[PDB]
Write a protein that binds this ligand. Structure first.
Ligand code: ADP
Ligand code: ADP
Ligand code: ADP
Ligand code: MG
Ligand code: MG
Ligand code: MG
Lengths: 7, 72, 372, 372, 372, 7, 7
């Protein structure tokens, strides 16, 4: 992702 | 009218009632030669060269449909 | 000959049919729905608005508007959709060809009639029209020329004393509690038990609860003490999703607001004391004939026990030797339509119609001149 | 006329083909490999990167990157190589000449669609493009206009309630467990028996073990006690080198994490309780039609017994008189592509495409305006 | 004499203190956490549950439950832990010795006051208790006997018209949007920019973002076009780990759902039109005094610009010559507690308490009889 | 709640 | 209505 999870 | 019929043959849970609704949405006041009969939602009028002819939507889709399963 | 159409614009239902029919051919809720969600599937066939039973069936997707409230037509484009649906889809009849008998509640705005005429002659091109007071028709429906008609709809309640075929227009009471304010009160009280009904589609579950399970107490305080002391009055119903809900003393409490409008914060007296106050405005020679022949009418009088509570509670007011009788036929829900059907078929009536020639000459104001 | 291309960028597989075909013409893993060893033999013919089945065949020599994870495209140069491979090598078609219907998981970042459009118009110069929510296509694929589609891929899981062709976008759940997190859990648990699978090439042995031998327990504790008490569930598989490995209670333990994400340390509830919690966000009038028509979709729902476990464990949640039905066609792995193939062939759709004229006028932001 | 305790069980915070204090002595989030991970280190000193600021501090390790949602107490064992923590740890007071004035939102289920009383007399053995409507206290807090209080918490929003000290219970609106549904919408929209906040501990980052950076637009469409056209509204915030996140037009978009609940798929009208629809249910003599004295209350009204947007958008509804005034004291977050503190200290009030003698005689039903 | 909503 | 009641 960009904040939460890794992608 | 033929193209929207072949579409309604393969859209899920298509029916003569939703076909008729699509005809009205697409042509009813956009085209001068297509008319809706005053007292029905299950018919439409085409202004042919000879005369106006009123077609009944009940059982177009059953007649319209061929698909032959190859395995048969 | 061509029959007249007979059409009754309740707040809650449309009843429509042909004169001389014994019951209405089309009854459906006078409701217009619009989609309130994004249209994801391509080629589904969108529709701008549903009407009547179509909007009932879809009502999970829709905001539901009622276009009449308190017998006043509050937006005309919807009401015109409802009439269009009535003539073309439900009756399947050309309005070009039939007189139309419309209907109205007494003492409501004069603008409502004018518009209701203008739309019949301009939009539907009806040959001839009439507008009739609701409470007058319930006497034709019940075989009487004398009585005080209590008529209660979805939107309005009114008393009209009629003696020997003369209305007494100074004695007309109109009271603005009806089935819809019972329904909003029922939602508010149901909230006490934890059930909350919020949306317009969800209101119309409560309407069905009210119809199925409500009844009128014959002593409000005694059944209050009973249901406070026993489970015996508690009864249960299934919501559409299968949740079961259980309803107790509250089920008599909502129709009690008809007899105690203070529950809704309505200052006015209940239907019993406005009925008695209507008879007390009539000339003393006729009270004996209006204490018999109290005619109930319209759906909000369909509650079990309302006739007994009325007779009991007027008999506490009236002098001890007047025979109080309440007359409540089981078809009283349709009685206004049945009486319209009788009225439109009389041959003496055929001079009364407002013909299109006269509307062309006079303009819509004629409806006040050529009508009650 | 020119057919549209229909191409579905799963996290795990590319499915691509032509609209109106009944099944996709090209399916290959969306994987990009690069050589990680010294090139000793002169004149072998080096290659900078392999894609898809080429990278599967060589995978002992290669580092394998997935360029999509959790449905987000995380580096574009690889994804652009994969699309290049799809158009030019697998379909062998000039993208100049065919509309392309792409596909996306709901509720993911808005930048992903902007870039995914920009690359189609600038790089591939496609005439016209569209982007469609995955779970919407599975209803076209399964002949329904109403249902709650549970769709689970390699990278993402989502529920999308659709009633009568309207989506209910407040009720859409997205949950981030999928086939790849099952695979990483499977490697972690397999380490218990001594088997250790470490590298990216060796992960994709574990994926094939998971596909062949895993299944979902219909009562997790009873089969745990069984396989703890008997060899009867123990089953065995050959690694590529001929080592045999043997797998017991553990083979049901990994797909159970779909129903108990706490095994992975995921706080959120499992797919069953997110399905029920999605239906509980819908209007109470439509729940009865969303309790039927639970549509399974995507490969991660292919486990034996998952439909029975879903029906069982939703039936424990829903009210006792709702008919819970789970609908799991055997082609549900391809159902998103099949539904895209149906959608792209409708004549009503041909107005919906984003044509290059419109992208030139508006720029890529148009994808939010002209699309779901 | 012994002071009363004054304790307000918001959905989001507990405020507690002693009557006659000007501000609450204990404010902490009404949240209960339980550990969700394996306890590896022996002898650390495990704890089954944290409450309030303890659960905030540990919240990376914990599942955080709110035991009140929408002003309804949804599991009692947690709420009893929260009260235990309030009396013994935060106030450090024996509940044996002080009357307790509790507080509740109007029109919620009656089983909530019964239990909330039963637990005070059986568990805490309080001498005497009372329960007071939240929106009534904000008038004591703002020096008025007339006004329409708009009060919005973490869980519920309600309007309560009060004129000259009489409540008008038919005109009470309750609306179920509040700070927590703003937070869930904020998480859903933030996902557009790529930030995803999933877990219950991580939700409570978003709550702090909402408090710090959100504001209400004075023209939603003009600022939408502005922030679509300029970086000037874009503002940035640090997550606990030091990642910076950047937030644009979205920061006004979430409190706009108060004025357009359709963003959440809520059918009902916004807080402005429910305020106006509340004044339209009051008698026409008092509307002029309810158009002044719109009192804001509770934390969800703390957004910058909400008073101006309310005044603007009611003034579009009310007749052109009514003086619309919005009254928004800067302490309005605590105003319900301040008004409870005033009410519990009046000498005329000391007859109103439910004494344990009366609860012993009557049982918990007494709370409906001896209270609003 | 008990019907119309989750609580 | 026009003034008293809402209709
Ligand atoms: N059996 C019944 N018991 C109680 N209320 C009813 C019953 N049938 C209808 N109603 C209520 O009465 C109203 C409909 O009455 P109706 O006479 O049709 O009104 P209108 O004449 O204004 O259309 C609605 O509020 C409906 O809920
Ligand atoms: N029969 C099966 N049983 C279990 N898992 C499967 C099966 N088929 C595919 N998978 C797994 O599901 C994922 C592929 O599912 P798919 O629907 O193709 O993902 P996507 O739609 O994102 O491409 C991979 O993790 C694959 O290992
Ligand atoms: N300055 C602020 N701006 C916007 N929202 C706030 C602010 N302070 C608190 N809130 C929100 O309002 C709610 C708390 O309000 P409060 O009045 O304490 O609720 P309750 O009275 O039910 O405990 C929470 O949702 C919190 O996020
Ligand atoms: Mg009627
Ligand atoms: Mg998929
Ligand atoms: Mg509050």
């Amino acid at each position: 992702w960009x904040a939460x999870c890794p992608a | 009218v033929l193209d929207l019929l072949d579409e309604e043959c393969k859209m899920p849970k298509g029916s003569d009632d939703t076909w008729a609704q699509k005809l009205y949405n697409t042509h009813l006041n956009k085209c001068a030669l297509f008319e809706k009969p005053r007292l029905s939602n299950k018919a439409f009028i085409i202004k042919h060269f000879a005369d106006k002819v009123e077609y009944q939507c009940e059982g177009f889709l059953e007649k319209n449909k061929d698909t032959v399963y190859e395995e048969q | 000959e061509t029959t007249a159409l007979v059409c009754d614009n309740g707040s809650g239902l449309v009843k429509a049919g042909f004169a001389g029919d014994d019951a209405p051919r089309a009854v459906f809720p006078s409701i217009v729905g619009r989609p309130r969600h994004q249209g994801v599937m391509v080629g589904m066939g969108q529709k701008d608005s549903y009407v009547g039973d179509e909007a009932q069936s879809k009502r999970g997707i829709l905001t539901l508007k009622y276009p009449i409230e308190h017998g006043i037509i509050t937006n005309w484009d919807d009401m015109e959709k409802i009439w269009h649906h009535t003539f073309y889809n439900e009756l399947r009849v050309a309005p070009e060809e039939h007189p139309t008998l419309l209907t109205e509640a007494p003492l409501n705005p004069k603008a409502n009639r004018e518009k209701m005429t203008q739309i019949m002659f301009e939009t539907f091109n009806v040959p001839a029209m009439y507008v009739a007071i609701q409470a007058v028709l319930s006497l034709y429906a019940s075989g009487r020329t004398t009585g005080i008609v209590l008529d209660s709809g979805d939107g309005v309640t009114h008393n009209v004393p009629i003696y020997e075929g003369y209305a007494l227009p100074h004695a007309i009471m109109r009271l603005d509690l009806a089935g819809r304010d019972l329904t909003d009160y029922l939602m508010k009280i149901l909230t006490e038990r934890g059930y909350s009904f919020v949306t317009t589609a969800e209101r119309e579950i409560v309407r069905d609860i009210k119809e199925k399970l409500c009844y009128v107490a014959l002593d409000f305080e005694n059944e209050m003490a009973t249901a406070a002391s026993s489970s015996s009055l508690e009864k249960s119903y299934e919501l559409p999703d299968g949740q079961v809900i259980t309803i107790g003393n509250e089920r008599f409490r909502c129709p009690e607001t008809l007899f105690q409008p203070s529950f809704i914060g309505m200052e006015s007296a209940g239907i019993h004391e406005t009925t008695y106050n209507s008879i007390m405005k009539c000339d003393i020679d006729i009270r004996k004939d209006l204490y018999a022949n109290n005619v109930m009418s319209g759906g909000t009088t369909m509650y079990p026990g309302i006739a007994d509570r009325m007779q009991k509670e007027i008999t506490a007011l009236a002098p001890s030797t007047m025979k109080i009788k309440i007359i409540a036929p089981p078809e009283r829900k349709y009685s206004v339509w049945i009486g319209g059907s009788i009225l439109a078929s009389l041959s003496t009536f055929q001079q009364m119609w407002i013909t299109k020639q006269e509307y062309d000459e006079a303009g819509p104001s004629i409806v006040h001149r050529k009508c009650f």
